Amino acid sequence: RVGLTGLTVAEYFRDEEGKDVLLFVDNIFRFTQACSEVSALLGRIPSAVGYQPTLATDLGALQERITTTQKGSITSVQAIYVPADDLTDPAPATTFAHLDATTVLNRGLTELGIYPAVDPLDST
């Protein structure tokens, strides 16, 4: 719920202040992981690969509360960690369904002396 805490702080400025907000969130993998851990402790049967049955609902809430309204907007720049480099994993798969753009940081560009880490081709 720490992720939702920062969101609530941003929603205040969105509605009351009416100004645009930029919500930085650590890699969503640990967010989805925490939701799976709390679900297991409560006694819920895990999902295919151990996630909670409420993955879509638990994740949908966060991804839906972040949008543009008539008062303001909350642009979220969150990192994406793919476990075991499996794009078909439920966590990144359900996340990509909501992401509108992707910023892929490449290590090679830094070596050449160019230090915007973003990759022009990989980014979409």
Binding site: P46, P53, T57, T88
Partner: protein, 91 residues
């Protein structure tokens, strides 16, 4: 999410039963399976392959089976369906 597809389908049958023609479009149904899979796991039901319930087939079939072309005597109405499915790795 589990009930929305059936609710919309009933709206299409209205035009079908009144001789009219309707085209109902179902967004990606994998979301429904996840929503139905959620309720299933929460009900302590035994999960099958890929953690999907054994009756997941009947879930989608019973819905699409109602979209058909009624004869002329009943009104000649129809109900076209365009179900969508999202493939993770194109497999």
């Amino acid at each position: 999410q589990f009930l929305a597809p059936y609710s919309g389908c009933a709206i299409g049958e209205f035009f079908r039963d009144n001789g009219k023609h309707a085209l109902i479009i179902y967004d990606d149904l994998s979301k429904q399976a996840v929503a139905y899979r959620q309720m299933s796991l929460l009900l302590r039901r035994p999960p099958g392959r890929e953690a999907y319930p054994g009756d997941v087939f009947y879930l989608h079939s019973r819905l699409l089976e109602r979209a058909a072309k009624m004869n002329d005597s009943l009104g000649g109405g129809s109900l076209t369906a365009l179900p969508v499915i999202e493939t993770q790795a194109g497999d």
